[PDB]
């Protein structure tokens, strides 16, 4: 009975509504990062933990986009027990202590989501809320992460109720992304206007240009340098330890094996 | 320009086929997107992405992990080079005398040196039928020269 | 015991670095779809392409009959359709 009452009051209740998915995902990103960094049976363990962080993040996205408090309850319960049971499978550590710690933060923010509820407006990219410079840089960085952009799109499509196909979902995502980047730039130009016909600031030019040139230098010259440096190192003294002179004389029985060694 | 008209035609055909199939089998206005269709395509894409990052790592580790082929000294050649001028004392043995230590034998050695952690470690870490017995022959007959 | 090298290059960094490089380049390959899908919605979202396939098939018909003067003329239509996006909208209208 009591357990049923607890669960009823964790589902039906009368609480508020917060969106702490951003922070939950950030906790899981930190977790992923430290497990990736913590490659140090061990490779197999770290590879299983990789697949795990990933799978759990995907399930979390599902429950967030489907606004399931009951689903989040179930996931939390399972995950708590499973991660705590993985402490018993230590057989393949500061890295693991930190992984536990950051996963504890994820469990705390997840527990908050369940006990608060899911807010009506869940859609909308976190880094496209304001149109400043920080939002711009963060968004572009998210787009630079190998597969985050595409994963987000496909995943969201699968959960969110749409009439459009993946092709068309990706179209509206691309349009929005580009439009946001343009908006941020437009906003910053309104905030900090540049006089009409004001060169381009010698220093700015020198910086960007210099970096590009140096990057190009490191495409051609640097590899050559590294290559030559490593290959050049050659030469380890090799001296005959012994002087074995066998003066094989007799055709039938070769002898005369008087010879010497290192002392001589 | 030949390639231009070929590209245009190819694209136009693909569009036409899609238009025709939508006329043949129309999709109601505002009818979700069918949960199953989504789950299928999305799932495949995710799995393909999994196989870009995780699968190579798995394969790599699997192959590389396999390591360890027993290597035991076939013979125990103890040449006690004594005489500076003429080094001799070559009484030594071979495989018949050499005894690949069994599991029980290994336990014995490990327990003998159990007090010293690293001593036992050496023995225990080396796999059974690894530690070989140096039963070097001591008898002579070979006079010296 | 002996240890057979089942790596080839270097498990620690050689193969590792190669793996990273592959992932990145596959990254760009996959981006190649979901980045500029919106720069073609003018050549790929045409409502009715029937009038354009007629043009294309007329070029083919005029090459079989070897009246290559009209090949040049019908090619001119094709390139102007694809040089002015507004005329594509007109020509690809669903009904008329």
């Amino acid at each position: 009975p009591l357990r049923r009452f607890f669960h009823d009051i964790l589902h039906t209740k009368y609480r508020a509504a917060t969106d702490v998915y951003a922070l939950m995902f950030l906790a899981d990103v930190v977790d992923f990062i430290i497990i990736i960094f913590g490659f140090w049976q061990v490779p197999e363990a770290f590879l299983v933990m990789l697949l795990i962080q990933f799978s759990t993040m995907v399930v979390d996205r599902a429950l967030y986009l489907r606004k399931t408090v009951l689903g989040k309850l179930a996931f939390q319960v399972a995950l708590v027990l499973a991660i705590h049971l993985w402490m018993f499978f230590i057989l393949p550590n500061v890295v693991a202590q930190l992984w536990y710690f950051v996963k504890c933060i994820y469990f705390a923010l997840s527990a908050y989501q369940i006990r608060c509820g899911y807010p009506t407006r869940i859609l909308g990219n976190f880094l496209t809320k304001k149109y400043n410079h920080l939002n711009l840089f963060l968004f572009q960085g998210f787009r630079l992460v190998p597969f985050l952009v595409e994963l987000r799109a496909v995943m969201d499509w699968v959960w969110t109720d749409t009439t459009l196909s993946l092709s068309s979902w990706m179209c509206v995502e691309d349009i929005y992304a580009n439009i946001f980047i343009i908006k941020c730039s437009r906003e910053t130009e309104k905030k900090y206007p540049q006089p009409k016909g004001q060169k381009k600031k010698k220093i700015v030019k020198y910086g960007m240009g210099g970096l590009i040139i140096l990057f190009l230098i490191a495409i051609i010259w640097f590899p050559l340098l590294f290559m030559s440096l490593v290959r050049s190192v050659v030469g380890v003294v090799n001296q005959p330890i012994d002087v074995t002179v066998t003066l094989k004389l007799g055709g039938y029985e070769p002898l005369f094996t008087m010879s010497a060694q290192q002392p001589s | 320009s030949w390639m231009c008209v070929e590209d245009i035609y190819a694209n136009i055909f693909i569009i036409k086929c899609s238009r025709e199939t939508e006329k043949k089998y129309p999709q109601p206005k505002g009818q979700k997107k069918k949960k199953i269709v989504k789950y299928g395509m999305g799932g495949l894409i995710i799995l393909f992405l999994i196989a870009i990052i995780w699968f190579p790592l798995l394969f790599m580790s699997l192959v590389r992990s396999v390591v360890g082929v027993v290597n035991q000294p076939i013979d125990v050649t103890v040449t006690l080079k004594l005489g500076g001028y003429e080094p001799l004392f070559t009484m030594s043995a071979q495989q018949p005398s050499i005894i690949p230590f069994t599991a029980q034998a290994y336990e014995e050695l490990s327990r003998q040196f159990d007090p010293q952690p690293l001593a036992m470690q050496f023995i225990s870490q080396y796999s059974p039928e690894d530690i070989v017995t140096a039963q070097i022959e001591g008898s002579s007959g070979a006079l010296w020269r | 015991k002996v240890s057979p090298p089942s790596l080839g290059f270097l498990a620690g960094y050689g193969i590792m670095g190669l793996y990273v490089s592959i992932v990145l380049v596959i990254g760009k390959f996959v981006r190649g779809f979901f980045s500029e899908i919106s720069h073609s919605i003018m050549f790929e979202e045409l409502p009715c392409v029937d009038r354009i396939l007629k043009l294309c098939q007329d070029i083919f018909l005029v090459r079989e009959t070897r009246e290559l003067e009209l090949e040049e003329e019908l090619y001119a239509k094709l390139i102007f359709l694809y040089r002015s996006p507004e005329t594509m909208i007109k020509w690809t209208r669903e009904k008329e």
Binding site: S165, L166, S167, M170 | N11, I14, I15, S18, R19, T21, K34, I36, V37, G40, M41, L44, I45 | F33, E44
Partner: peptide, 21 residues
């Protein structure tokens, strides 16, 4: 429970992800 109607849908839409429509 993948129906044949769903199966063609899936296939065609992955083709649309790569090829046009």
């Amino acid at each position: 429970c993948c129906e044949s109607s769903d199966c063609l849908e899936i296939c065609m839409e992955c083709c649309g992800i790569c090829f046009p429509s």
